[PDB]
Amino acid sequence: KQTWHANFLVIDKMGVLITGEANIGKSELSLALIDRGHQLVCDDVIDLKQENNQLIGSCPSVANGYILITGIGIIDVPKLFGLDAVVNQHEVHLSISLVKPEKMPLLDDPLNPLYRTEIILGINVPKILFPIHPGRNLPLLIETLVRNHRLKMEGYDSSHHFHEH
Amino acid sequence: KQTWHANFLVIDKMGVLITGEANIGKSELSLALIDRGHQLVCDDVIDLKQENNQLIGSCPSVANGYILITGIGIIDVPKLFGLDAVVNQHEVHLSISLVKPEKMPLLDDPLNPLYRTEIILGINVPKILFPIHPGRNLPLLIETLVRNHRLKMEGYDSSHHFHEH
Amino acid sequence: KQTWHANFLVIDKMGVLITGEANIGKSELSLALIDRGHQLVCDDVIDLKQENNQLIGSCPSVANGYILITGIGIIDVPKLFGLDAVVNQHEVHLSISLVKPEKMPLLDDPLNPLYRTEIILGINVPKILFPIHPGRNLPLLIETLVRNHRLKMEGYDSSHHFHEH
């Protein structure tokens, strides 16, 4: 069965995978997102599976509910942020890849995010390359990026349903 | 008629103009300030005019309500933060100029901000030079700077009115 | 009588001393912590004394209630954040020393903070060396570090009381 190296959070109903280089503040981003009222599925590694044409991501036991942040150590998220701050599984909707500005590819349309696609167990998951600047309120930026994505996906779902004619 | 290159926000009843070099997180600052409960007038460019001894700043249509943040793209602020998160016009009270610490002039009195004056269509608008350090919670700092300014202006208005003797 | 160079805040019932090199955002950290609902005892310097087997820290008058942040100047914290945002004294429970990542010593157990002890007027105060990265939401990190510490101290107090057998 299938593992995947990333953090997995529920943000605005969207299961969001977060990826990037080591020691850029990913785990710190998870914490900040939890503090804004979002939810943790898993830190570091995720179990993946297909059930009913859904890519579901789940955290293995033992590690469930815990986050590591250097300086702090282990964080029992449920103890500190409530039982509703953690979820045992959720569908994967989006994959965000945090990239250093210098390594960021050229932008075709700067009025939109840099969208790509990730193949996760043969399923197309939308993927955004997001430039990471230190101290521009990254949690708010990622939350805003995800909410925009959900509106955009609902935009396509409306358009498809609009073809009832 | 008169344009002006800056961001224009309403903060604690004060119309505040934000200026600075390119790619330092100005638009990201606007978003963060909106998230703290403040209001957007306009991103990038502002229409200015004089009405009843007031310098009023207004956003041109089409662009009204939208913010661009690299990585995210366009942000329909009303859709995401509510109708009350945007305002069509407001009086200009303060101009903050975000400066890199290295380029910051010498400080005469470090117990107060570095105050200057901007001539905007012949009107004296108070101007603060604010040093920008990455990740010291700039939104909170700018909010605090503006609230202090309003108290200070109310201090002079009290003093002037105190000369009833 | 005894002074001590540090910032002193009440965080989650814990009197916390904050220390570090000059111009790293300590005073900015105090402000941010106040904004999260915590309390100021004193900026810069603290009066210390022993009363009833407690190390109590108190702010000298005149300076009481005020914070200096370069760019802003003086901040009357009570005026801006309420009377309950400042406290005249509190017991010292923890000492956090903000360290630059490069100067940070080797980590024995990365699942826990780097704990040391400070002798303050002959009393053992637990001391954490915390690595400071710009823009990972340091206020949230320090708040989380302190809440974890309180749980940990309550853990030892439970264990000691558990030796009733």
Three state DSSP letters for B16-33: EEEEECCCCCHHHHHHHH
CA distance linking residue B151 with residue B44, whole number of Å: 28
* Pick among B18, B21, B26, B28 to test the A interface (most A CBs inside 10 A): B28
- Distance (Å) of CA C52 to CA A152, C1, C10, C11, C58: 63, 17, 20, 22, 15
B102 exposure class (CB count in 10 Å sphere: 0-12, 13-18, 19+) = exposed
The span from the CA of C106 to the CA of C129, in Å, is 11
Whether residue B85 contacts residue B115, with contact meaning beta carbons closer than 8 Å, is answered with no
Chain B residues near any Cβ of chain C (below 8 Å): 107, 109-114, 130-131, 133-137, 140-141, 144-145, 147-148, 151
Residue B42, Cβ density class (10 Å: 0-12 exposed, 13-18 middle, ≥19 buried): buried
Four-CA torsion C40, C112, C115, C45, nearest 10 degrees: -10
- Rounded distance between C-alpha atoms, residue A96 and residue A29, angstroms: 12
Strand-strand pairing, C14-20 and C7-11: antiparallel
Q: What is the interface size between B and C, counted as CB pairs within 8 Å?
A: 58
For chain A, list the domains and their CATH numbers.
1-165 (3.40.50.300)
Q: Which of A118, A112, A121, A148 is nearest to A57 (CA)?
A: A121
Among A154, A91, A93, which Cα is nearest to A125's?
A: A93
3-class secondary structure, A97: strand
A94-132 burial code (b ≥16 CB/10 A, e <16): bbbbbbeeeeeeeeeeeeebbeeebebeeeebbbbbbbb
Facing B35 at nearest CB: one of A109, A131, A140: A140
How many other CB atoms are there within 10 angstroms of residue C39's CB atom? Answer: 18
First to last CA, chain C: 43
Q: Give the residue from A155, A153, A129 showing the smallest Cα distance to A14.
A: A153
Cβ-based neighbours of C110, under 8 Å, separated by 6 or more: A68, A70, A73
Q: How far apart are CA A36 and CA A32, in angstroms?
A: 6
Is residue C8 a contact partner of residue C57, using CB atoms and an 8 Å limit? yes
Task: Tell me if C80 and B140 make a contact (CB, 8 A cut-off).
Answer: no
Name the experiment that determined this structure: X-ray
Longest CA pairwise span in chain A (Å): 59
**Alpha-helical runs (H) found in chain B:** 26-35, 77-81, 138-162
Note every long-range contact of A103-110, with CB atoms under 8 Å and residues 24 or more positions apart, other chains counting.
Answer: A104/A129, A104/A131, A105/A129, A107/B70, A109/B73, A110/B68, A110/B70, A110/B73
Residue from C34, C35, C46 nearest C10 by CA: C34
Alpha-carbon distances, residue A77 vs A69, A72, A73, B31, B119 (angstroms) = 12, 13, 12, 28, 52
- Return the bridge partners of C36, or none: none
Contact C43, C68 (CB under 8 A): yes
Rounded to a whole number of angstroms, the CA Rg of chain A reads 16
Q: Two tokens at C156?
A: 């030892």
- Which residues of A sit within 8 Å Cβ distance of B? 107, 109-114, 130-131, 133-137, 140-141, 144-145, 147-148, 151
User: What subunits touch chain B, counting only 3 or more CB pairs under 8 A?
Assistant: A, C
Q: In terms of Cα–Cα distance, which of A72, A25, A131 is closest to C134?
A: A25
- Alpha-carbon span B125 to B139, nearest angstrom: 21
Alpha carbon separation from A115 to A6, A24, A78, A119 (Å, rounded): 18, 21, 33, 14
Question: Which residue in chain C is spatially nearest to B101 when comparing CA positions?
Answer: C71
Residues in chain B: 165
- The CA-based angle A67-A32-B101, given to 5 degrees, is 125
Q: Inter-chain contact A148–B73, Cβ cutoff 8 Å?
A: yes
Q: Resolution of the coordinates in A?
A: 2.8
> Smallest Cα–Cα separation from C25: which of A27, A34, B24, A135?
A135
The answer to whether residues C130 and C101 touch, using CB atoms and an 8 Å cutoff, is no
- Amino acid sitting at position B85: A
- Give the bridge partners for B100, in sequence order: none
Record the tokens describing residue B83, joined without a space: 């109708």
Q: Contact at 8 Å (CB) between A130 and B71?
A: yes
